[PDB]
Amino acid sequence: EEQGNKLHWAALLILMVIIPTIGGNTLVILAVSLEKKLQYATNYFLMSLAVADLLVGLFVMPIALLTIMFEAMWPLPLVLCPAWLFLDVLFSTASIWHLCAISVDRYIAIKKPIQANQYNSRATAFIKITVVWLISIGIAIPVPIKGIETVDNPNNITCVLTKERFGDFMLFGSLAAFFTPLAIMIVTYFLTIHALQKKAADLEDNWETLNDNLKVIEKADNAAQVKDALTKMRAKDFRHGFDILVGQIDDALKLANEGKVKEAQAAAEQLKTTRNAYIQKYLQTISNEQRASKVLGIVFFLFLLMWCPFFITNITLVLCDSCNQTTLQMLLEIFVWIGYVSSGVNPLVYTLFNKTFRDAFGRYITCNYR
Numbered sequence: 375e376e377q378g379n380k381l382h383w384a385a386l387l388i389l390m391v392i393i394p395t396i397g398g399n400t401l402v403i404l405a406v407s408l409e410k411k412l413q414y415a416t417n418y419f420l421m422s423l424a425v426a427d428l429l430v431g432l433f434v435m436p437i438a439l440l441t442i443m444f445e446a447m448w449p450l451p452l453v454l455c456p457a458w459l460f461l462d463v464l465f466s467t468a469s470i471w472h473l474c475a476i477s478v479d480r481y482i483a484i485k486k487p488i489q490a491n492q493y494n495s496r497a498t499a500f501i502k503i504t505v506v507w508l509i510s511i512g513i514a515i516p517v518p519i520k521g522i523e524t525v526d527n528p529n530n531i532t533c534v535l536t537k538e539r540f541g542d543f544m545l546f547g548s549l550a551a552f553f554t555p556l557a558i559m560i561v562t563y564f565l566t567i568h569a570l571q572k573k574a575a576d577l578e579d580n581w582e583t584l585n586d587n588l589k590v591i592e593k594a595d596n597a598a599q600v601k602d603a604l605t606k607m608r609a610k611d612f613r614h615g616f617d618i619l620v621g622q623i624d625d626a627l628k629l630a631n632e633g634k635v636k637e638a639q640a641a642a643e644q645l646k647t648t649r650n651a652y653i654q655k656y657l658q659t660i661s662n663e664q665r666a667s668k669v670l671g672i673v674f675f676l677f678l679l680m681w682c683p684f685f686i687t688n689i690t691l692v693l694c695d696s697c698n699q700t701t702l703q704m705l706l707e708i709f710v711w712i713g714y715v716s717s718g719v720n721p722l723v724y725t726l727f728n729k730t731f732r733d734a735f736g737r738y739i740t741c742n743y744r
């Protein structure tokens with residue numbers, strides 16, 4: 375009885391994990407770098423996430439792949455062991471916290487439509503990116519500092535974190551790298567649902583007010599009613615609609631003061647084609663916001679879902695004393711790769727819902743770059 379040979383698994387992983395990861399993230403980086411249209415603040419998150427996922431595919435996965443074909447033994451120099459473990463925890467944690475930063479960033483966009491200057495957005499973006507990387511470095515730093523337990527005649531050292539030396543880090547590190555942002559994203563999810571629901575209402579409320587007052591105006595016999603039902607209505611591109619409407623209200627009110635109801639009611643008629651222009655525009659944005667938020671929700675949920683097996687089994691392998699550790703480890707060795715896949719192809723799947731990105735990709739796969 376023997377372990378056997380796992381060459382076919384290695385081949386499989388090279389085919390359906392590493393290549394997808396590298397190719398996908400490369401495409402995203404190329405897209406953002408080449409396309410002028412795509413060079414705005416919020417896409418710099420994506421580029422930062424892409425690099426993180428790209429580096430996992432270049433430096434982390436192939437070593438993880440080596441360790442699979444040479445047992446617990448560590449063929450590389452010992453010094454590269456804590457380094458590989460550092461980069462692994464670093465990049466993996468970064469990809470998760472990146473999605474949390476995007477989630478919250480997108481919520482604030484919906485809630486606070488104003489204050490969206492690109493000039494500020496770029497700086498603010500960079501700051502956020504840097505914070506995410508700082509949080510990642512923070513979470514990953516215990517590994518190299520603690521070091522690995524160290525030889526007789528040869529070196530029989532296995533490159534792995536032990537439950538005796540890193541049980542806490544595994545527990546609190548898991549809490550820090552996965553469950554915290556998960557909670558944050560859940561809260562953000564519900565805040566976003568509430569935000570949109572709230573947004574939809576106020577619009578219908580103002581529609582109602584306008585319609586009601588216009589109804590009052592169009593049936594008015596005297597001037598007092600017209601003048602009365604006009605002040606109630608009086609309550610860069612954003613302020614333009616305000617100036618226009620308020621201007622028209624004042625124009626009609628100026629006629630109402632004159633006592634020319636026939637003129638005012640006619641001026642009020644023009645307000646219909648005016649409200650229909652801004653209500654139909656404002657009511658259109660929330661639709662896109664809703665569709666977008668739904669897509670991001672599903673996609674991000676799938677990402678989070680594919681990481682559960684690892685961190686849950688991780689904490690269980692630490693806490694559960696009665697559980698069979700052999701099977702738990704055997705499971706972990708798979709769940710690690712399921713996680714690698716998750717983070718590996720995430721940015722691509724996400725950006726594939728954008729026509730610009732998607733077209734760019736289509737042009738890049740045929741090797742045009744023009």
Ligand SMILES: CN1C[C@H](C(=O)N[C@]2(C)O[C@@]3(O)[C@@H]4CCCN4C(=O)[C@H](Cc4ccccc4)N3C2=O)C=C2c3cccc4[nH]cc(c34)C[C@H]21
Binds near residue numbers: 533536537541551692
């Ligand atoms: C994907 N990556 C995997 C990586 C890892 O397990 N690397 C080793 C080398 O591989 C193991 O899984 C092997 C395979 C099967 C048996 N193994 C183990 O038992 C122990 C896990 C363990 C240690 C102590 C106690 C319980 C379990 N392994 C290891 O140390 C650690 C990560 C991590 C740990 C803590 C916080 C984190 N945030 C992000 C991450 C991360 C990224 C995340």
Ligand SMILES: CC(C)CCC[C@@H](C)[C@H]1CC[C@H]2[C@@H]3CC=C4C[C@@H](O)CC[C@]4(C)[C@H]3CC[C@]12C
Binds near residue numbers: 398741
């Ligand atoms: C695993 C080892 C043996 C080989 C792995 C090589 C990988 C990195 C190769 C295989 C297929 C290659 C991709 C094939 C096609 C494209 C589209 C092109 O417009 C830019 C690069 C890109 C995205 C390549 C990036 C590198 C790539 C993903």
Ligand SMILES: CCCCCCCC/C=C\CCCCCCCC(=O)OC[C@H](O)CO
Binds near residue numbers: 433
């Ligand atoms: C084993 C020791 C660990 C390291 C082993 C590495 C093995 C990687 C194998 C193939 C490299 C292929 C290189 C492909 C790099 C693509 C980067 C790319 O071109 O994207 C940059 C961007 O497009 C520009 O703006």
Ligand SMILES: CCCCCCCC/C=C\CCCCCCCC(=O)O
Binds near residue numbers: 391711
């Ligand atoms: C994009 C499609 C995703 C590709 C699927 C890749 C998922 C990886 C699956 C399992 C890898 C197994 C590696 C561990 C070796 C032992 C395998 C075993 O005993 O079953």
